[model samples]
Target chain A: GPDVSALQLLSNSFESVFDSPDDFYSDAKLVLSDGREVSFHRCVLSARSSFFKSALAAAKKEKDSNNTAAVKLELKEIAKDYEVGFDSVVTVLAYVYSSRVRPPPKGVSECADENCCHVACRPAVDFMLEVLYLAFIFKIPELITLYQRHLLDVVDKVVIEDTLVILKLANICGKACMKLLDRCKEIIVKSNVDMVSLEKSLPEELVKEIIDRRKELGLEVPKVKKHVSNVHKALDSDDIELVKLLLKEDHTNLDDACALHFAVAYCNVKTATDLLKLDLADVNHRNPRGYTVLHVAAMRKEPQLILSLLEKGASASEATLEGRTALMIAKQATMAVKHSLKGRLCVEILEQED
Target chain B: GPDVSALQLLSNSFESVFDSPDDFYSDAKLVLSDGREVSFHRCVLSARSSFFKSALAAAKKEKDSNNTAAVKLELKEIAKDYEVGFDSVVTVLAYVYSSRVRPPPKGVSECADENCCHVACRPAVDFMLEVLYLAFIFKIPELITLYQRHLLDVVDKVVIEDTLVILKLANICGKACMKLLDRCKEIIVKSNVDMVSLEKSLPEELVKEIIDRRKELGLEVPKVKKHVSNVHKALDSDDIELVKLLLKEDHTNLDDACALHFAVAYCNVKTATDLLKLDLADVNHRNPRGYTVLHVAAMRKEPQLILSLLEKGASASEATLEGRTALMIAKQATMAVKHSLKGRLCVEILEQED
Candidate 1:
């Protein structure tokens, strides 16, 4: 149904998937010290290596090379035009397999020291990083959790120089990933990982822009724990006016921290909804608990609270230090939520309006 | 309702909370540091001035006493029992109402180093670390979150030596607190936050224990596609044997990865119970998705699955990586679950019924 240009673009994108570190092999190649020209066929070869002869034959059988290339062109065209990736293909594969890509090496010790290099190397980190970038850019957030864990592992073992390279690559790959990388840098540096080189490696202006944007993203503020005990008592008193009055008169402002966090943690849904409606709280704010208001709301298990917070525009991209987002938290909290309102609330609030 | 021996054991255990770290601190100050007469309370004050308040009021009252030494002893006992100093009391009072303590030094950096020191200082780091430890050990997770941002900011500027000391203090805290501290170490190390002394300062055994525990807690394996897919197929085929067989063929065996997680996530009550009877799977084995078999079972939102899992020795304390125990996850998962299983599961499970 697509035009020739569109189809061509699709093919180009598909081919690019092999080069861009989006595919497992290419990603591995990027981090791996060994220089192996990992192609699509090669990746498929290994993936299907374990397949029975009949299944392998079925996979390899190709009556129409022209159609395959044409299909690839169409994918490339779609990517160029819409700026998406072959991740849909990867996702489809994941859907088909019902499992995740192989996890990165378990430890720094597992990585090769440039001599005994393989496809599963540091380049795999880079390759996975690209997939993460693509996922963030396309708003395919489930993959974000996948990539985050991989990224965390990468950042942990890579030399400070590699961290710099990785961040730069993220910026080049996608704006959203750059934003996350910058935020992660702040947390990592504070925790004692020195990326001073990362801060200094890039141009001052680029670093400045990244820093400014990170602040704009409110990485500095704790977005959870919006309520104090007194606030809960005030809300239980059923006095929004009293609540507002206290908000003004109290030495510490609930808005300054996540008052919504407190209410959701201890108070009822009505009170939480009331606080959310005031719009004084940061909806996507992550408090030091690494919880966005949405995460706490998910924890509250109040469908009404989750709906209220999501309806107000909370983000699912926010993960705690443990690499879990609000959606993952909600999913972990309730598989019923996978079908029920809790799961749907995350999907609803995180995605753009239908 | 209870026996005297039980009470003594309870008393001993409760005292152990204050004593384990107290003993460690004692050894550090006396045996390790060679007996400089450094009291645990005194060292805490020296490192973190806010840990103690001056005995000015007691001194003033002592002017009227014939036994000034006895009065001093009474004051010291109060401070020692709480493991705090006179300054800490004043600080606590000042927190309730901003009065009593002298104003913090103006303009001058809190830094010991005159040249390279910024406004951030060791005293601030010490204060933040102690308060955080107190909040954690005292059963107030929310309060710890409240101080999270401030504590992290102080940690950012903490010198390497001070960070090591903070880790040492954390090593001595209560078992529950040490568990949490171990998690903190993991987050920092895995996220590349604090590598300064992560390897050397924190012992290999301690760090390995954390890593092993983290791996055991299971958040690294991909569950959504892999395990979920296999279960779905099993459900589709109505073939438990196929599911078990398929799982065995995967990279991780069902028993190793957790069949209960799959059962709870996919199958109905009968299936979950049937899976439990297999006796090969741990009802509480955590998958790489950071879900215990029971945690994932909670995600299923099936009352039957929950009851079946609980009947099989599932632990409520086994939380995901986000600090959400299985019980909390269940509580947050099924709002309707509260009423559905309340008296039944809660009462039945909280039992020693033979």
Candidate 2:
């Protein structure tokens, strides 16, 4: 006589291995920004995510080439803007190991706003952003669709400033994230965040459209001093001689100004690296926004510039007030501009710390 | 800004790890009866099986003592009657690891009955028999429910002779398997496999009840010569000195008669071991049943009897024409005899074949 049902047995076997103890076969890892790593099987990742498939292929190619060990691919290589934590990565791995939808990971799904019922709280949205962004990066469309719907459902309830970052994430996701993009756009046009912050945060055309559509609103505040902006303007011009001329002035001193943050964020890589050598800037100096030059460079997501920052003693381990390490903030920006080869190598450069 | 829904992602992650390459975390193993191994995690097994939980607990307790290594608890410890191949045990292990019903493992689920859609052919029957008994042994209720239904449905389609063993399996499982028990009893009462084979194959009570119900069937045959029985009858008397007189008979040499086979099957341990010293026997000699003396002791399910047979140089690796080794035959009979200490140690002894 025949035996029994097939899938019934498979689902159990797969699910039971979830977060298992003494998993004797885990061969790789995804080390989170938080220093906690989630173990993985290269084959499993290869089976599910082309992103991982390509990465592991490279990792193996390099393993034979004096290129690796259990190099827990730090999240920065794939991440941008927000740090993907241990909690998010584990649930995502659990997702690939199973055959059907189970439940959202509850531990991370709740927000810190104890009085706010999580219908749409900050942590809830943050966790969703990270997971959905991961789904898009891992290239699993069903999950893309799954989380795409979740974001659409709660996009309106999120505060306006956070809404702008969601729009940035949607832009990085390109055409597939149009629904999230369109919805975030619909909400932001009617909201208030000043023009300079908008222009600083997004493309000129996007700023133009938001301004044109706003019939709109803002409460603006100028941040840095006029003297700091003057130093920033000269550094932006990539004129290191001008930076030298400015450094000797009292208020124009590199320590008093946002010179390095501005150079890392907006100057050429050669200019950024040049600033490191001749001008005696405090490499770890905080911008008014409470981010170091390395943090600003991570937000800029330039691999070579971050490399220069590390050589000049900008700590890869320093965190912002929000506790985001350079790698964490670097990985936060998932993007659509096709040349993210610059985006992808950020983690490797930051960790090399030599 | 809420993140994604939970369950949609979990199942995929769970399934991807299946049979993955470079599983860097596997810690334990289930070495199959065939000596091939399947690795496991202690916590996963502990989470799903109380049997494994207690076994692992006991295993750890013994670690500080002289008790273990990665002691591949050879399948024989929990096995009886049939040797479970790697195919059956992996599927069963996978079953305990999942939470939902999926499909039966395709590779081993089919039978040699090529034209049979595995709706219960011999190999199909054998695989199911092993899995169901394991489900019963591992004490999983859902799996019990899963397989009991399959047995009940397939009981009639199986060959009448195999029906008896299924009934034996049913007996070992007791109350939970009543439907299988009743179905096999109903079919066997109407079929003809003969009285002697029935008596030898089942408990006296089961044989009696079948006879009591069979007012309806026949097919008996005599086996063995009258001369051999006369020599065997003398050995049966445990009358060893009288056997000295019998050895003097022209046709009654111990070499020609089934002396050692009979002694090991029906005598006490002291009497069985005594025959080993005085009578020179071809310990590897096969009975008309086409099984070795070691095979008979395995059927006896006594750890001590198997030990004595091994000492006499009875090989453990010989198989019956049906292709079951002594250890395979030993593990075949999953039982409900309250003290199965005798049954459980059969494999440990047979493999020890010192």
Candidate 3:
């Protein structure tokens, strides 16, 4: 009881400092990926976080070597490779300060979609994964436990397509998030999803793992119904040459496969650029679902594709059978996802209204 | 479960911002008495602190009308009469940011007295009282609970002489610290600590309450004994003229009551100056405890008194029976109290050894 009450009081005091840190005796900087630098006290960081402690030590060592330099730490250069956003990084750091987990501040976690509940949305998943990645990297066991538990709840309810994103994150999040990774992998493997779809989203090792595991389980890769689906395979691999050859041989009709739609959704900018140069494919071609290339591109939420599709003559004003235009789809995509960097970038680009 | 975890995560994130506070979007400045300004985020201050919220709102309203002034929140000016130190104010404000109650940083709480544990010394009590005042004013109920608990632990352990400080703080800290106040009052009343000693340290209201309580309980106020006793009574009232008249009457000697020593310890700067001006008292005279006027002045930890005593030809080189000089006594006093404004000021004055 003494230990519990003392720790609780300690936590409360730490939380009090965390809530109003204006007077924190900061000695180091934690630079977020969004070019935002947070000032932190070295003692606090070293006390609670091994990652920051080592990083600060290294910074100190470097400063000692370069005697002419002031002792200000540059964490941005050190943590540059971590692709997390500002909100998640600060949230993770707050845990180090006070051992408390807080939500992403307003407009950081909520989707632009007014009608949509925040739970299991793409934006919510994106933000959580960013924080989870930080927690895993920082090796906060309790935070790992906290985030892994949250991700498991989200993994079951999010769109199956988003499982690839979670699987990708879980793969990097180390052993602590194995349950999350396993759950995501199981969802993908159990579903009748294609290799082409997985290839487009997953990395080489993950794709191989899924394929090898399927073979080990004697599960078929599942046959495609009525398309020269190697075209789909080519698109997945970003193999523009194979796609060009298939189109030249007339084995796969671009209109039939809705190749432009696939290119807009999954293809890299260079591959998509090459497909546009072919100029044979109709940029505005609608798929079987009555959605145009621009509609799919809007859902993809890639600024480059949205801009390129519009450049290649995909009309924003053209509506779906449901009266949803590319603009409407873009608006819907914005609402569905949280205020992710790419989400905002895509919306800003889409609102060009050209 | 995810939602709950998410909320926890959110709280942690908010707390993290409080801990590191490098990228704080501070909208107001908490100007301290020492002319040092601390920047604070208005949203955070408003959300966690009612004091800041109202003050910030008032500043905003004033700014709207004036249109020329920036929205700066001056806390020292707002609580001008409150004799709180900067460290304690910030420590309490840090609670408003996070929820953690941290001790006053290093030098702020520890007395200079090497032999003293700093647990219940003058400096520790002073720092805690400063924080307690802020907690009471800001209406941080949890901080009130924490400080009150800490004060209670300290009250019974501290020297009886210092109990008056606790009593004074408890009086101002409202109902939350009533137990602390009552306990301190009981300690003062139960002991033989006289009204003269109480008058020098405590407020008029508290002194009256103690006398009233003692009377109600049928307790007697102890009388002082021996020569120049009225001089001690005059020094208690800081009445230099009465002390001069009593000394002129010549019935009671300065050596008899250590009148000069009492004056140096308890009298105001002017009264102490007036006593020295009489030129009839022995400046270097030691009391029954073998403490000279200068030694007693050092123990009082008043910079002006230390300077005034040296100006009146009191010897800093004179040692106690234990071979401790006024300088040694001054150093020991510094070690017993924190690096308080007055404590440091006393050290600076005493360090100018003759």
TM-score of each: 0.18, 0.49, 0.51
Residue B101 alpha-carbon offset, candidate 1, angstroms: 84
Q: Model 3 misses residue A240 by how many Å?
A: 30
| Models ranked on lDDT | 3, 2, 1
User: Model 1 segments beyond 4 Å from truth?
Assistant: A1-229, A236-238, A336-354, B1-354
Chain B TM-scores across candidates: 0.30, 0.56, 0.75
Best-fitting candidate, scored by lDDT: 3
- Ranking of all candidate structures by their DockQ, best first: 2, 3, 1
**Interface RMSD for every prediction, one decimal?**
33.6, 10.0, 12.8
By DockQ, the best candidate is 2
Model 3: per-residue Cα lDDT at residue A131? 81
Candidate 3's displacement at residue B139, Å, is 1.7
Q: Over the stretch A1-354, how does candidate 1's per-residue lDDT look in tens digits? A: 222332233223333433343322121111111222222322222231223223334433353442122111123322332222233345423321222343333432222122423233443555566566545544444566656656765565443434655666555555446555775555434442212323435766666555554445545732234346466567656668787887778657665545666567756677766776786655665565356677777655566676666567666566776665655454433322012354445544434433
Find the 10 residues in a row with the least total lDDT in model 2 chain A: A331-340
lDDT per residue (tens digit) for residues B88-164 in model 1: 33333222211112233332223322333343444445455555554454333434555555544455444333455
Alpha-carbon shift of residue B223 in model 1 (angstroms): 90
User: Model 3: per-residue lDDT, tens digit, A267-315?
Assistant: 6777777776678767767754577777777877677877877677777
- After superposition on all CA atoms, what RMSD does each candidate show versus the true structure? 42.0, 16.6, 12.6
- Report lDDT per candidate: 0.45, 0.64, 0.67
